[PDB]
Design a protein around this ligand. Structure first.
Ligand SMILES: OC[C@H]1O[C@@H](O[C@H]2[C@H](O)[C@@H](O)[C@H](O)O[C@@H]2CO)[C@H](O)[C@@H](O)[C@H]1O
Ligand SMILES: [Mg+2]
Ligand SMILES: [Mg+2]
Ligand SMILES: [Mg+2]
Ligand SMILES: [Mg+2]
Ligand SMILES: [Mg+2]
Ligand code: NA
Ligand code: NA
Ligand code: NA
Ligand code: NA
Ligand code: NA
Lengths: 1011, 204
């Protein structure tokens, strides 16, 4: 039948979908969510053989183990075991577009398991098998007999195995197809893998059983009273003596309980549902659920007889909260949300798409610790445990159907096709059926990048009809179609419109007010954290805070999808698209996360953390005003620490308890500040520290910070005049300057400082020269590639202008002696094919104190693309252990991504001064630096710098960090000016005008001396 | 202006004068100006200026130089924005070209006198025998900033001797969203803390 090439057959013999069950046979276990002996895991070692097509599978496998099979752990993705290659393709489908067909060579994974079943499960009741995740379709046999088939790789497929098993040993056989017509609906931008990748379990339920249950909670106007409504359905024989009891508990206290026989109210001319009952429980002053305080109750649903015998129990965590859109705003418990969200795919660098509880927990804790309060399931329903974690830790969730047909042309070709409505319907309906009792899910999504088709409209209505408790969103077709309650664009800019035909991406501020528009706007994806990125992040937050209807967004995205490979030496390395021989592929576009695949943060996460703070601050005088952005909680685990330092030198500090109601303000007066000892800038830094541990943080966690400059006393004191004057030696070849133990050499033919010595030690490996380029970031390169250049990408503009190839022409090099110093004057022109790109005029003035003051004035031709940077660079001879500086830090920071950095004195090992992005590029800059110390050298001024053992040239020539090699010495890049890094998206220029070096003329000054 | 340093060095084909000053009030140093004047064998005087402004002092209205020239000439010719008066936050209509007007057109007769007649984006200014070149903003007229600020009606102003030249490296915006509260937008406030500008003064 080739059911895998027919969108009309998405399953055979599969059981209905329903919320998580466990069939407890003890009610107390159900109350506390204890393991159920009736719900067994079949995870562990299974038998597996790979074939190139279903046609190659031997019939013998149905009845007997294949001797050639191997033993492997399940769940797993077979690519992760090496049986075939995983493929990283973004939009283009990994298979030829010829719906509903798939390739004839279609990798088939044959899995089997011999396992025991006790007679007690078979004497009464029903025994079903549950596959929580099988990618992408499969047939199942039990003891040689065919049982059924299923599609939708991200929802559980359940089959009744009652009539197929026997006491003792039994054998399952699962034939899993890599590609199927379901693949047409699974075009998400992620690695393409396959296998039995989520749990497999066996559940025993009695013949008379709870087959479904829906919990709703409704409130009065101020949320001081709620009614919990639980509709319960049964299967099996109706009998007057059956009863359902629904009890609600808060911890160990029973709050309410209600019992009723089956028999629902009249629904229409034919009667009501005799197989259902709805229990209604009143709750006075309920403790409400929120991401701020995830208060939970437990609903326990008991199926029993009137005389008191329990048949079985099911149950769930219940969070009392209301979600609604009113007057253009999304409200939770009546208050308007500010979504500090992130998209998160299910990805593990070693396990592929298999998720585990440790990793899940680790992600949620980092999220919370980084001031995220919400997550979008991009782009499919997740492993069931994720929802339980979000309910208990407290995160708002966007649950999204596993529907993405991005590679179709036009994008809605299938979603506007009624013949695809069935398949799409089950992807939405089965998800709601499974997840509708989780309080953490606050919004449903119809899928991702599948255009806008009538199928969407039908499904949007279906959800609105069956679950009015939550809004429905969907971005396809323009982000604001009739299929979305929320304007949910991806990568729309704050102030800049991108007026694409048919599906424009308007500036978000402007979008809200188009004629007739009244919906809230929450970006489904924003700020593309690929590589050195997140430039412009603060611009979103300032807009979200100023505009009521801009209610936030989900950052793109949480974690890089890099996979681990091993080199010839067995050492691991991070790989991306094309590294498995996969092609076509989309190379590094699979890595766009705030964190690396192992969960180590990239520097951008700190930027997110700061912009997403829940406390805002203002300073007036000595008065700090703290305003809380919490909607529900008081600041009862928070104190404010303040410190004032003079040029990094600590002057005073204190602590004050924060006592701020939600949305309230607190005024803190700082104490009088005595006058600092000397000249300099006083700076105030305040931080909010949580003194007590929480379920998601350690005691002492810092949740927010901010700084301000205080009084400045400019230095007006004259330095004590040199007890010696420098000596110049002129030669045809060089201008040399000597002063004591020091010596500086200026090459007269190049016009550069080519060498310096301290004692008899040379300090330079390469001369000090102007630098106007950077090893291109992912955002500078965009979609450009050698075989397919994007002439609009910054990198190509610079390349085409000759920025990377221009050579300095010396125009002038002179030496003069002053009363107390020697003065070298240079001027160089950088040219390309006859065009003068930049002109650098400098003076170096070396005085009796041993200091070399460098003044630089650059001219940039107005018609050349604005340059990446304006600075100097050199390779120093030394490698020292520490980097110490007075400037912004401690982490990497760029012009358009420096708000989280603080001005202070920082000292880190040199390796921390390098950010190991997988795809290497310019990295490690620190901006707003007034002093930098390395080895015996000190440089002072107002500049940006990076320092590491890798040259810009090496960085731009290397595609994978594991291939980099430390060079002799230390490469220092000191910039007077650096361009922004951008990031609103990674496929089009995204550096805002104010961060482009378009001024024409630039000036900067450095003092280089010994320390 | 307290003098912190004033030196002279003779060079190969010029004389360099270096100066440093601090403006203070009550003991607070508001601004520091560091300059070098380089006079070469060609007769040109290159001035370089580096100013520091205390971060805690209100952002200043301008950062520039001024003098009263002895000369009074009929025309003003410049290469920059014009022809009419233009300020940083009000110069979109002005065009960059070579303009030449009579001196009085370089004065705007606001009934309540104030700073006026500036022209921005100027690369060369000619007045009588003088020529200034660089990238500055300037105004030029027979009235001192002092006179403007102390006179409340345009009809009471009197031409002073000579000509007042105000040449700025930077000038704050004029604002106008309203006239009863501060309205100069942040981007047009002089808050950079350190400012650099340079000019060359020569004859003809
Ligand atoms: O992380 C990748 C990102 O891609 C966006 O799609 C881009 C695509 O990368 C680009 O090659 C093409 O020019 O434009 C597409 C946008 O139309 C996806 O929108 C986003 O979801 C991610 O998949
Ligand atoms: Mg099918
Ligand atoms: Mg037991
Ligand atoms: Mg047997
Ligand atoms: Mg896509
Ligand atoms: Mg214009
Ligand atoms: Na808002
Ligand atoms: Na991607
Ligand atoms: Na507190
Ligand atoms: Na590179
Ligand atoms: Na006046």
């Amino acid at each position: 039948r080739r059911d895998w090439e027919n969108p009309g057959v998405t399953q055979l013999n599969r059981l209905a979908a329903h919320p998580p069950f466990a069939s407890w046979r003890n009610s107390e276990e159900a109350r506390t969510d204890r393991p159920s002996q009736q719900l067994r895991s079949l995870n562990g070692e299974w038998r597996f053989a790979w074939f190139p097509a279903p046609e190659a599978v031997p019939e013998s496998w149905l009845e007997c183990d294949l001797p050639e099979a191997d033993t492997v752990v399940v769940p797993s993705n077979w690519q992760m075991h090496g049986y075939d290659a995983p493929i990283y393709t973004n939009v283009t489908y990994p298979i030829t577009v010829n719906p509903p067909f798939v390739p004839t060579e279609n990798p088939t994974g044959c899995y089997s398991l011999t396992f025991n079943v006790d007679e007690s499960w078979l004497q009464e009741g029903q025994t079903r098998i549950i596959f929580d995740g099988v990618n992408s379709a499969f047939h199942l046999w039990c003891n040689g007999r065919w049982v059924g088939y299923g599609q939708d790789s991200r929802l559980p497929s359940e089959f009744d195995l009652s009539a197929f098993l026997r006491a003792g040993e039994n054998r399952l056989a699962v034939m899993v197809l890599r590609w199927s017509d379901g693949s047409y609906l699974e075009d998400q931008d992620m690695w393409r893998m396959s296998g039995i990748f989520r749990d497999v379990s066996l559940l025993h339920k009695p013949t008379t059983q709870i087959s479904d249950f829906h919990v709703a909670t409704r409130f009065n106007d101020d949320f001081s009273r709620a009614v919990l409504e639980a509709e319960v359905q049964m299967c099996g024989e109706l009998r007057d003596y059956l009863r359902v009891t629904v009890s609600l508990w808060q911890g160990e206290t029973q709050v309410a309980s209600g019992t009723a026989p089956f028999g629902g109210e009249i629904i229409d001319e034919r009667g009501g549902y005799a197989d259902r009952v709805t229990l209604r429980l009143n709750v006075e002053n309920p403790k409400l659920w929120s991401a701020e305080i995830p208060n939970l109750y437990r609903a326990v649903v008991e199926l029993h007889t009137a005389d008191g015998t329990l048949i079985e129990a099911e149950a769930c965590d219940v969070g009392f909260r209301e979600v609604r859109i009113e007057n253009g705003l999304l409200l939770l418990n009546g208050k308007p949300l500010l979504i500090r969200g992130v998209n998160r795919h299910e990805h593990h660098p070693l396990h592929g798409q298999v998720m585990d509880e440790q990793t899940m927990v680790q992600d949620i804790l980092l999220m919370k610790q980084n001031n995220f309060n919400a997550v979008r399931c991009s782009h499919y329903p997740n492993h069931p445990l994720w929802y339980t974690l979000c309910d208990r830790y407290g995160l708002y969730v966007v649950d999204e159907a596993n529907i993405e047909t991005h590679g179709m042309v036009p994008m809605n070709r299938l979603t506007d096709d009624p013949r695809w409505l069935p398949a799409m319907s089950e992807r939405v309906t089965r998800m709601v059926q499974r997840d509708r009792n989780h309080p953490s899910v606050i919004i449903w999504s119809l899928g991702n990048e599948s255009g806008h088709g009538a199928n969407h409209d039908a499904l949007y209505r279906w959800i609105k009809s069956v679950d009015p408790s939550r809004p429905v969103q969907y971005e396809g077709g323009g982000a604001d179609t009739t299929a979305t309650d929320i304007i949910c664009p991806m990568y729309a800019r704050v102030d800049e419109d991108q007026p694409f035909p048919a599906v424009p991406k308007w500036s978000i501020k402007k979008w809200l007010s188009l004629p007739g528009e009244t919906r809230p706007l929450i970006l489904c994806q924003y700020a593309h954290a690929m590589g050195n990125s997140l430039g412009g992040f603060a611009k979103y937050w300032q807009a979200f805070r100023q505009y009521p209807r801009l209610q936030g967004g989900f950052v793109w995205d949480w974690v890089d999808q890099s996979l681990i490979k091993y080199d010839e030496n067995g050492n691991p390395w991070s790989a991306y698209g094309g590294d498995f021989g996969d092609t076509p592929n989309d190379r590094q576009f699979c890595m766009n996360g705030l964190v690396f695949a192992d969960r180590t943060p990239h520097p951008a996460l700190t930027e997110a953390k700061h912009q997403q703070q829940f406390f805002q601050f203002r300073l007036s005088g000595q008065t700090i005003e703290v305003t809380s952005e919490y909607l529900f909680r008081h600041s009862d685990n928070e104190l404010l620490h303040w410190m004032v330092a003079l040029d990094g030198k600590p002057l005073a500090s204190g602590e004050v308890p924060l006592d701020v109601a939600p949305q309230g303000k607190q005024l803190i007066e700082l104490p009088e500040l005595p006058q600092p000892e000397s000249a300099g800038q006083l700076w105030l830094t305040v931080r909010v520290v949580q003194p007590n541990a929480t379920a998601w943080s350690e005691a002492g966690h810092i949740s927010a910070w901010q700084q301000w400059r205080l009084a400045e006393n400019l230095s007006v004191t004259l330095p004590a005049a040199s007890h010696a004057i420098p000596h110049l030696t002129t030669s045809e070849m060089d201008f040399c300057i000597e002063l004591g133990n020091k010596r500086w050499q200026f090459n007269r033919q190049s016009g550069f400082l080519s060498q310096m010595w301290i004692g008899d030690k040379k300090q330079l490996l390469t001369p000090l020269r102007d630098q106007f380029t950077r090893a291109p970031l992912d955002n500078d390169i965009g979609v450009s590639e050698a075989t397919r250049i994007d002439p609009n990408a910054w990198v190509e503009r610079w390349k085409a202008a000759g920025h990377y190839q221009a050579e300095a022409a010396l125009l002038q090099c002179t030496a003069d002696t002053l009363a107390d110093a020697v003065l070298i004057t240079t001027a160089h022109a950088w040219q390309h094919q006859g065009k003068t790109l930049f002109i650098s005029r400098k003076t170096y003035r070396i005085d009796g104190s041993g200091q070399m003051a460098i003044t630089v004035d650059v001219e940039v031709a107005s018609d050349t693309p604005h340059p990446a940077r304006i600075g100097l660079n050199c390779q120093l001879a030394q490698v020292a252990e520490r980097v110490n500086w007075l400037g912004l830090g401690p982490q990497e920071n760029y012009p358009d991504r420096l708000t989280a950095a603080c001005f202070d004195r920082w000292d880190l090992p040199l390796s921390d001064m390098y950010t190991p992005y997988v795809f290497p590029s310019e990295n490690g800059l620190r901006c707003g630096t007034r002093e930098l110390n390395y080895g015996p050298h000190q440089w002072r001024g107002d500049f940006q710098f990076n320092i590491s053992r890798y040259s810009q040239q090496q960085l731009m020539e290397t595609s994978h960090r594991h291939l980099l090699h430390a060079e002799e010495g230390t490469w220092l890049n000191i910039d007077g000016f650096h361009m922004g890094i951008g990031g609103d998206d990674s496929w089009s220029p995204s550096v805002s005008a104010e961060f482009q070096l378009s001024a024409g003329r630039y000036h900067y000054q450095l003092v280089w001396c010994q320390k």
